[PDB]
């Protein structure tokens, strides 16, 4: 089975949902749980900071996307490919991809479209893993993510 994909989706899904609801999911993690738990803590620390440091730009892009429904949510894939995939890859940019995804998740809750949060997480994971697998594998995947941001 595609383990990198499965793990990425669990991490991204949990962060997005936690960010939108303000509550942690206490379900145990799936495979590679230890690493996934550390990746989630890393994301809470660096992801939350990113949304604040670039809050104005984040509010500007959200406005531009003018999300009101599911079709609008489905159009986000093309934008992520255009902006994230078409550029030099580094951990900072992957954190921005996921951090803005969480910013959108919060927005989805505000307009009562929470059911779109998991599909959004799946869209983000598709872009990340399916367009940057070689890079991720070379940087040791999520174990590398955790080491890179280690305090």
Interface contacts to ligand LOD, rule CB under 6 A:
57-58, 61, 76, 79-80, 83-84, 93, 96-97, 100-101, 104, 120, 124
Closest approach of ligand LOD to the CB of residue 96, in Å: 4
Write the burial class of residue 138 (CB in 10 Å: 0-12 exposed, 13-18 middle, 19+ buried): exposed
For ligand LOD, the closer CB: 124 or 136: 124
For ligand LOD, the closer CB: 32 or 136: 136
Contact yes or no for 128/94 (Cβ under 8 A): yes
Closest approach of ligand LOD to the CB of residue 104, in Å: 4
> What residues contact 3, with CB distance under 8 A and at least 6 apart?
31, 32
Closest approach of ligand LOD to the CB of residue 148, in Å: 16
Find how far residue 37's CA is from the centre of its chain: 15
Could you say which DSSP state residue 139 is in?
T
For ligand LOD, the closer CB: 101 or 141: 101
For ligand LOD, the closer CB: 55 or 147: 55
Tokens of 11: 């991490």
């Amino acid at each position: 089975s595609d383990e990198l994909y499965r793990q990425s989706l669990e991490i991204i899904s949990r962060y997005l949902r936690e960010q939108a609801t303000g509550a942690k999911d206490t379900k145990p993690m799936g495979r590679s749980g230890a690493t996934s738990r550390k990746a989630l803590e890393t994301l809470r620390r660096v992801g939350d900071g990113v949304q604040r440091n670039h809050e104005t730009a984040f509010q500007g892009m959200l406005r531009k996307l003018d999300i009101k429904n599911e079709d609008d949510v489905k159009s986000l894939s093309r934008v992520m490919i255009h902006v994230f995939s078409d550029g030099v890859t580094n951990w900072g940019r992957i954190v921005t991809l996921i951090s803005f995804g969480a910013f959108v998740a919060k927005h989805l809750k505000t307009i009562n479209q929470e059911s779109c949060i998991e599909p959004l997480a799946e869209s983000i994971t598709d872009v990340l893993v399916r367009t940057k697998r070689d890079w991720l594998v070379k940087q040791r995947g999520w174990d590398g993510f955790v080491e890179f941001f280690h305090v």
